[PDB]
Design a protein around this ligand. Structure first.
Ligand SMILES: Cc1cc(NC(=O)CCCC[C@@H]2SC[C@@H]3NC(=O)N[C@@H]32)cc(C)c1OCC(=O)N[C@@H](Cc1ccccc1)[C@H](O)C(=O)N1CSC(C)(C)[C@H]1C(=O)N[C@H]1c2ccccc2C[C@H]1O
Ligand SMILES: [Cl-]
Lengths: 99, 99
C-alpha cells in the first residue's frame, strides 16, 4: 500500500493475541507499546526523545502483524503516550519513505 | 528518492541560508528545529513526545528546503534532541510511506 501523511499513519496491529492501533513512526528507532503482557525474559531500558526519557521493558523475538504484514523483533513495553511501530519492524515489512 | 529505514532517515535541510541535518519523522505532526534565529513574530505551542511535553516557539510561513525540495510552512523551535521534519512539511514535499 501507499500511505499518505495528511493524517497520522495509524494501522491495526496484532501482538500477543491482542489487536491494537499503532503509529508507523520513522523517527522511532525501536517499537514501543502500552502496557501489556509478553512472553519471555525482559530487561529494563531507557528510551528518549522530545520531553525526555521513559523506562520500558525490552522483550526480544516478538512476532507481530502490522497491517497484515508479519514481522519479528524487539518490542518495548511501557508508558508510551502512543503505540509506536519503529524502524526495527518497519524495515521487516518493507516500508520505505518515498518522494 | 526512496528512503529505506535500516538507518535513521536523516537528510540535509536548508533554513536561513544554512545547512542542517534533520530526521524525516512520520510520527511528528509538526516540524521542530533546535534553537536558531528565525524572522518575524512567534506564537506559543506545547507538544508531546515520548518523554513528555516541551514548550516551543511557532514561526509561520518559513522558507525551508528538505533534501533539495522547497517548502514554505510552519517551523517550531525548542528543546528537541533532533531536528525533526514532521508531517506538515512531509506532505509539502510529497512524501508517502510505501510497503
Ligand atoms: C506527536 C506530535 C504532535 C504535535 N502537534 C500537536 O499535537 C498539535 C495538536 C493538533 C492535533 C491535530 S488536529 C486533528 C488531528 N487529530 C489528532 O489527534 N491530531 C491532529 C507536534 C509534534 C512535533 C509531535 O511529535 C512529537 C514527537 O516527539 N513525536 C514522536 C512520536 C510520538 C508521538 C506521540 C507521542 C509520543 C511520541 C516522533 O515521531 C519520534 O519518534 N521522535 C521525535 S524525537 C526523536 C526523533 C528522537 C524520536 C523519538 O522519540 N525516538 C525515540 C523512540 C520512540 C519510540 C520507541 C523507541 C525510541 C528511541 C528513540 O528513537
Ligand atoms: Cl536505510
Amino acid at each position: 500500500p501507499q500511505i499518505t501523511l495528511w493524517k497520522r499513519p495509524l494501522v491495526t496491529i496484532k501482538i500477543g493475541g491482542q489487536l491494537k492501533e499503532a503509529l508507523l513512526d520513522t523517527g522511532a528507532d525501536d517499537t514501543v507499546i502500552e502496557e501489556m503482557s509478553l512472553p519471555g525474559r525482559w530487561k529494563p531500558k531507557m528510551i528518549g526523545g522530545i520531553g525526555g526519557f521513559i523506562k520500558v521493558r525490552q522483550y526480544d523475538q516478538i512476532i507481530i502483524e502490522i497491517a497484515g504484514h508479519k514481522a519479528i523483533g524487539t518490542v518495548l513495553v511501557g508508558p508510551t503516550p502512543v503505540n509506536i511501530i519503529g524502524r526495527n519492524l518497519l524495515t521487516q515489512i518493507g516500508a520505505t519513505l518515498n518522494f
